[PDB]
Design a protein around this ligand. Structure first.
Ligand code: SF4
Ligand SMILES: [Zn+2]
Ligand SMILES: [Zn+2]
Ligand SMILES: [Zn+2]
Ligand SMILES: [Zn+2]
Lengths: 351, 754, 367
């Protein structure tokens, strides 16, 4: 009795840069009573969580937020790389209440307009949190979908408790045909993990596309305190960074230089990327009676191994889920922790 | 794939397979081995058409004998369905084999949907278009044109180009579906109708509606070249008997009788003027009568036959003169007496029904006109008109109506039954007496084909029970098998919503009327479904008047406003054209964003042939259970015949018919196994019928889902929709219910050869 | 729909956006009204804002519900201008030409606000929607009745304009009866059929308005063993564990640490002349955007003359700020002038470096 992914078969490519434009759904449907406060409040709360998470794991991307009220798509946060703006925008929205019908077509068109400036190496995306069971379009939709797939704009949507044919067509269409991206939910926890899996970059099997070197430079922190002075918000700020080339102060960020317009990063962002590129082989669960290995943990020192012949208890299993390449044991907690938070396998590091 | 049936290469066009399809192939081949009928209920959830055509094509192209295949789908809609699917099969077969095709297979419907002549086809009523094409290209107007080059005679000229090139040869090589046929024959400016009609002598496999098989008035040109031995397939055969009956019944209304009076007067004028001009030809035709039935030009008619032969195809016809009727004026007088007797018998006070023999004797009493002369009236009138070469038929439509009536009532006996209803009680006490005439025994119309052909099939996704048909149609079978939907998942949720929120038994049985409890209950049901299901929903009211009243007074309430707020409404209306338009907009909306509701009638045209795929149908309904006896006693009379002739009681037959139509409605909402969809019902009486349903429906209908209230219904369907939405694709449980490419069938059942 | 030159030339749109933000109009004018920048390039920086605004604008709402609803979901507020009054009426107009025409014709006289809509209730909301009123309130008068008569045949001709030759899968027409010439029976009471045709017609009109598309080793082990022994050799006198040993060494360690504590403490994680502070802030924003345009252009490249104009302007700005510092030192004295110089040091350095870099590149190109 195990619930594990068999194997990862695109551990070669992902979209590391991103520009994901999450589009919420604020329309009369979202006011029904299936999720604890409503659909809407729970949705926005989880949206905040996802914003934090996504801007953590992909700390070099941008993001924009879009609502769908009264059949209109009203941008509530410009495509920007500072999580706090989007966070505040969502805060503001959550106190406002939905109305009108969701105009999927308008939101789609607004996005396609929005992502034009994003350069070729950056990758586009949208994430429709579609909640209702209808749309209300002021135009042909398949027209838009065709324009989309022409502009190389992958789309993933998370329907609420139903399946809508057009959305299924939409996901199947933009994502190079390979349909896996219209996942819809059946529980709140399912919803949390839905957003979580939306956080990561997105491979399926990438067509051979243009791969391009991108100019960027790293800043150096500043020293003085009273000389507070800023060139990205025109304030007094007690000390920040210096563009190596533009050579002007910039308040703390991985932002783009507001003088000479080149990307700024430290490295730790690149480190996050590295973590996403080449993950580990999924740790194997050791055979119950065939292990005969050390009775402890390895990374930690846990005493949860077996019980040695106990009718049904020992017949159950032997908590020895052990990674492959280092071939050392690890208790369940250690394996969960390694594969979730820190991806340097303890033993596999040491040799 | 290319597997074997122990002798037969099978070029099944798909990599996958289905298990039930494989059983279907095995059993249908087993049937074709040994001459039988062997009705077979294969759920429409699979592809019955692909299995049928693949196996039969392979059989015909592998053995050397059964060179021809006849496929009778119920309506031209399913005709072109079979055609397009067959075309795809053929392309696959060539692709896998190269070119070993030499194959032609053609659809065959009618002029109205085929005549390409612009002005001609601009006409609406099919009869008129038929007449126009007849005149424009007849054996006579051509002579008028050629001998007398003049503006009087024109021509489609499509018939002419056919005469030039097509009747030496055939269309290139394709199994032309009507889209392809129309495009091509428009390019090469041909007349598709005559093309296929003449082509019948060469098509390897033919597809045509039931009427062309059973309606004797058009099932005349059956040229035993067509089969003489062929393998014959009835797809969607659950509505056979009613097709037979409707092919043999007949209506009469005093107004048409007066029309016939006018036509007879016009006939007197025509005969007067022509005999003033030319009568020697009329005497020549008298001689051609006195020699015999004039088959030399009453039958050897490339374009002539005017009044069809409503009697069975010439079996029940004599060949001598109609005695005194040889005189045209005599014949007109005969029809005069006939129509007047019909009028006076029509003025009868109240309902009266008689055997044809009884009515015949009564007429003899009032006017001693004998049966034998009477029978010949049809061809007599027709060839007389040909001798008259009239310029129009509209004046003679009532005349041919009366000719048909005379021929029928003078030919058959002890199976039919007259009835003279003086009015329509729905607007009772008004002048509208109808001389309704109908058959009772469905077997009469079929009997000739079961006599002619040897190996026949019966197939539908709905037939049940599989014994009523041997009873009614009186035919011998071999394999009466039903197939079970082996599914690795639920895939659809039959329910029986007997009690609304008020926990009150509901139906349409009470009346055809209002009872605001029932109305509000149904409206609540409909609107909550409209809230819950995604795009695409259907309903099936039991009868049209029912829908009219119900929706009218739904609009009375605000109920329709809510469903408007969610989805689209697309009603079903009697005119076919507007119906088609509405239906296509329904499809266009379903595949678009906005959900759309189409509400139609179970007995109606919509359920007959239209299909409802994944998107286009999620949650059918059955508001009430369809029953007929709302109207008058023709069903009562037929049921009387049923009870006396077959050991079947009234309510048994009525329930059987109702569940027949219910299953036919329900089966439409699935196409493959990837599809899915709720299939609710709604009435108290449904709960006890759970066994009448076809097997594969019954399996999914567990016991616990009976007489559910609307509320638990909504709960369950919500859970369903969510669960099915999941990508539950283990793909290893699908090795159980898909029998993957070339192997799992091979392995599994080559071992199961036990 | 949105193009770089299009937004560049969308002068009315640009001025609308000027009205959009006080900060925007301020920076723009001080880049313009101060004899500074042509608006063209100024927007050439700000293009995404323009695109966003434009899209946020021309956003036609759907037809659909509200369109319909405007006949169904709108049966209560018999008061004055109800919900979405102008919005609802325009939805009506796009939804039904007849009402728009009647209202227009009844502008010069007979106000369509109260009395127009009152009579409209009866006339239309009986005509459309529910059953034939026929009797009862037949207020459908004058323009109402006229438009009724019109709309009849109008919807007729529309329906006429709707008939496609539907693809022969669905063709119920050719499907029914147009195979044979048969004789059946039929038995399954006027009005309301029109209701059904009404809903069909409404829906189809809606959909069509949407299809329109509008040492190592040895010594290593040796020392190791030595230590191992020493350990094993009792020892480990934690008393002897240094404590601090040399009081001097101890002191030195403390010195190092207090030095570092002081230095890192110097990190205290408020200008005087608020008006001059704001003025200097404006100057910084100005010089920042000016340099922004250069460091765009000086990188990118054939518009050399544009770069020349930018460079001359930037040198002018540098001299301007030099004079600004001179005036600040003159008036505010030194301490305030010192604070200003501190506030402007980074930007000043950046622009000076840009000037020097341009001078170097210009010398390289010339020599
Ligand atoms: S078959 Fe030819 S002549 Fe006859 S109706 Fe069709 S197009 Fe006209
Ligand atoms: Zn700043
Ligand atoms: Zn810079
Ligand atoms: Zn551990
Ligand atoms: Zn390891």
């Amino acid at each position: 009795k195990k619930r594990t992914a068999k194997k990862n078969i695109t551990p070669y490519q992902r979209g590391i840069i991103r520009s994901l434009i999450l589009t919420l759904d604020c329309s009369e449907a979202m006011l029904e009573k299936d999720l604890r406060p409503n659909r809407h409040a729970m949705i926005i709360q989880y949206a905040i969580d996802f914003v934090h998470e996504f801007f953590d794991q992909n700390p070099i991307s941008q993001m924009g937020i879009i609502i769908m009220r009264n059949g209109l798509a009203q941008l509530v946060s410009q495509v920007s790389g500072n999580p706090q703006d989007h966070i505040d925008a969502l805060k503001s929205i959550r106190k406002q209440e939905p109305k009108g019908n969701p105009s999927l077509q308008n939101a789609l068109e607004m996005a396609r307009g929005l992502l034009l400036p994003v350069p070729a190496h950056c990758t586009r995306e949208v994430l429709i949190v579609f909640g209702s069971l209808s749309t209300t379009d002021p135009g042909d939709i398949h027209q838009t979908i065709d324009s989309l797939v022409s502009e190389k704009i992958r789309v993933k949507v998370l329907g609420l408790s139903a399946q809508v044919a057009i959305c299924k067509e939409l996901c199947k269409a933009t994502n190079y045909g390979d349909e896996s991206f219209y996942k819809i939910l059946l529980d709140e926890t399912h919803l949390k993990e839905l957003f979580n899996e939306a956080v990561t970059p997105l491979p399926v099997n990438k067509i051979n596309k243009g791969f391009t070197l991108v100019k960027m430079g790293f800043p150096t922190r500043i020293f003085e305190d009273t000389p507070t002075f800023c060139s990205c918000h025109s304030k007094l700020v007690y000390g920040g960074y210096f563009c190596p080339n533009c050579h002007s102060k910039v308040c703390s960020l991985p932002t783009v230089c507001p003088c000479c317009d080149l990307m700024l990063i430290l490295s730790t962002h690149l480190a996050r990327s590295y973590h996403h590129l080449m993950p580990l082989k999924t740790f194997a669960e050791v055979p119950t009676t065939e292990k005969f290995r050390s009775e402890d943990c390895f990374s930690c020192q846990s005493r949860f191994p077996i019980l040695k012949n106990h009718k049904n208890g020992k017949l159950l299993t032997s908590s020895r889920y052990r990674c492959e390449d280092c071939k050392q044991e690890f208790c369940v907690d250690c394996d969960v922790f390694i594969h979730e938070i820190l991806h340097n396998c303890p033993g596999c590091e040491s040799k | 794939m290319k597997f074997y049936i122990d002798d037969l290469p099978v070029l099944f066009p798909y990599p996958k397979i289905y298990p039930e399809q494989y059983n279907y192939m095995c059993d249908i081949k087993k049937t074709l081995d040994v001459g039988g009928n062997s009705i077979l209920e294969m759920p429409s959830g699979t592809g019955k058409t692909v299995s049928l055509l693949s196996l039969t094509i392979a059989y015909q192209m592998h053995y050397p004998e059964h060179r021809k295949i006849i496929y009778c789908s119920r309506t031209m809609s399913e005709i072109e369905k079979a055609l397009v699917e067959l075309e795809n099969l053929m392309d696959y077969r060539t692709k896998e084999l190269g070119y070993q095709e030499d194959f032609r297979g053609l659809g065959l419907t009618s002029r109205k949907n085929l005549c390409l002549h612009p002005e001609v086809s601009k006409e609406r009523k099919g009869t008129v278009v038929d007449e126009k094409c007849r005149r424009m290209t007849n054996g006579q107007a051509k002579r008028k044109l050629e001998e007398d080059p003049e503006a009087n005679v024109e021509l489609c000229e499509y018939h002419e180009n056919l005469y030039n090139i097509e009747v030496e040869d055939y269309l290139p090589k394709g199994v032309f579906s009507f889209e392809k046929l129309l495009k091509y024959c428009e390019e090469k400016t041909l007349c598709p109708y005559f093309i296929v009609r003449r082509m019948i002598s060469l098509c390897n496999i033919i597809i045509y509606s039931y009427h062309y098989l059973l309606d004797p008035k058009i099932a005349e040109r059956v040229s035993n070249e067509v089969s003489k031995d062929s393998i014959v397939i009835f797809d969607e055969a659950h509505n056979i008997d009613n097709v037979c009956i409707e092919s043999l019944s007949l209506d009469l209304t005093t107004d048409a009788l007066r029309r016939a009076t006018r036509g007879a007067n016009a006939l007197d004028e025509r005969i007067s003027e022509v005999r003033k001009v030319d009568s020697q030809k009329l005497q020549d035709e008298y001689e051609k009568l006195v020699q015999g039935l004039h088959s030399a030009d009453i039958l050897t008619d490339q374009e002539e036959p005017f009044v069809e032969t409503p009697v069975l195809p010439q079996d029940l016809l004599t060949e001598a003169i109609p005695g005194n009727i040889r005189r045209a004026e005599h014949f007109v007088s005969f029809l005069k007496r006939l129509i007047e007797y019909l009028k006076t018998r029509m003025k009868v006070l109240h309902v009266i029904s008689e055997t044809p023999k009884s009515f015949l004797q009564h007429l003899k009493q009032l006017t001693f006109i004998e049966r034998k002369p009477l029978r010949f009236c049809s061809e007599r009138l027709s060839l007389l008109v040909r001798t008259l070469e009239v310029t129009e038929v509209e004046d003679f439509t009532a005349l041919k109506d009366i000719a048909t009536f005379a021929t029928l009532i003078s030919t058959y006996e002890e199976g039919f039954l007259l009835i003279i209803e003086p009015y329509e009680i729905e607007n009772a006490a008004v002048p509208n007496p109808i001389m309704r005439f109908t058959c009772l025994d469905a077997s009469i119309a079929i009997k000739p084909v079961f006599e002619r052909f040897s190996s026949v099939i019966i197939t539908s996704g709905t037939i049940s029970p599989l014994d009523m048909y041997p009873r009614m149609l009186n035919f011998k079978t071999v394999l009466q098998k039903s197939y079970a939907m082996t599914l690795a998942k639920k895939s659809f949720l039959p329910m029986i919503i007997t009690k609304g929120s008020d926990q009150v038994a509901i139906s349409s049985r009470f009346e055809i009327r209002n009872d605001p409890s029932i109305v509000r209950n149904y409206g609540s049901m409909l609107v909550e479904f409209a809230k819950i299901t995604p795009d695409g929903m259907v309903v099936f009211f039991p009868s049209y008047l029912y829908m009219e009243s119900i929706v009218s007074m739904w609009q009375t309430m605000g109920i329709l406003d809510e469903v408007w707020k969610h989805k689209l409404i697309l009603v079903e209306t009697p005119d076919a054209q507007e119906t088609s338009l509405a239906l296509e907009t329904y499809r266009k909306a379903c595949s678009n964003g906005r959900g759309a509701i189409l509400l139609s009638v179970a007995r109606g045209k919509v359920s007959e042939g239209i299909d409802f795929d994944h998107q286009y149908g999620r949650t059918v309904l059955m508001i009430g259970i369809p029953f007929q006896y709302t109207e008058s006693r023709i069903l009562k009379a037929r049921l009387e015949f049923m009870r006396e002739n077959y050991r079947i009681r009234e309510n048994d037959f009525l329930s059987f018919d109702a569940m027949r139509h219910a299953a036919q409605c329900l089966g439409r909402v699935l196409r493959g196994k990837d599809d899915y969809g709720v299939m609710v019902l709604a009435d108290r009486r449904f709960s006890r019928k759970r066994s009448q349903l076809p097997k594969w429906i019954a399996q999914g209908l567990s016991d616990a889902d009976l007489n559910l209230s609307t509320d638990m219904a909504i709960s369950n369907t919500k859970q369903f929709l969510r669960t099915m939405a999941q990508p539950t694709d283990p793909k290893d449980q699908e090795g159980v219910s898909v029998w993957s490419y070339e192997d799992l069938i091979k392995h599994q059942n080559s071992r199961k050869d036990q | 729909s949105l193009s770089k030159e299009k937004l560049l030339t969308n002068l009315k749109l640009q001025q609308s956006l000027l009205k959009g933000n006080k900060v925007l109009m301020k920076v723009f004018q001080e880049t313009v009204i101060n004899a500074g920048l042509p608006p063209s390039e100024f927007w050439s920086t700000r293009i995404p804002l323009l695109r966003a605004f434009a899209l946020s604008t021309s956003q036609k709402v759907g037809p659909y519900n509200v369109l319909s609803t405007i006949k169904p979901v709108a049966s209560s507020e018999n008061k004055v201008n109800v919900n979405l009054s102008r919005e609802k009426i325009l939805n009506i107009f796009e939804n039904y030409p007849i009402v728009k025409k009647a209202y227009t014709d009844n502008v010069p006289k007979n106000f369509k606000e109260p009395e127009f809509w009152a009579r409209f209730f009866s006339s239309k909301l009986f005509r459309k929607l529910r059953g034939e009123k026929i009797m009862q309130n037949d207020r459908g008068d004058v323009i109402i009745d006229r438009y009724l008569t019109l709309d009849q045949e109008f919807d007729r001709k529309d329906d006429d304009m709707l008939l496609h030759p539907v693809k022969k899968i669905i063709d119920l027409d050719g499907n029914i009866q147009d195979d044979p010439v048969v004789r059946g029976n039929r038995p399954d009471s006027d009005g309301t059929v029109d209701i059904l045709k009404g809903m069909n017609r409404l829906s189809e009109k809606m959909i069509m308005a949407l299809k329109n598309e509008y040492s190592n080793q040895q010594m290593l082990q040796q020392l190791s063993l030595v230590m191992d022994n020493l350990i094993n050799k009792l020892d480990l006198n934690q008393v002897v564990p240094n404590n601090e040993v040399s009081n001097k060494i101890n002191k030195r360690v403390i010195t190092a640490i207090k030095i570092n504590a002081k230095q890192a403490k110097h990190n205290n994680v408020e200008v005087k002349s608020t008006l001059p502070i704001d003025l200097l802030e404006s100057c910084r924003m100005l010089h920042t955007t000016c340099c922004e345009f250069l460091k765009h252009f000086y990188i990118h490249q054939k518009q050399a003359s544009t770069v020349k104009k930018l460079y001359n302007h930037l040198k002018d700005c540098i001299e301007k700020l030099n004079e600004l510092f001179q005036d600040v030192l003159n008036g505010d004295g030194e301490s305030m002038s010192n604070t200003c110089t501190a506030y402007l040091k980074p930007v000043l350095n950046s622009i000076t470096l840009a000037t020097h870099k341009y001078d170097e590149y210009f010398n390289e190109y010339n020599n």
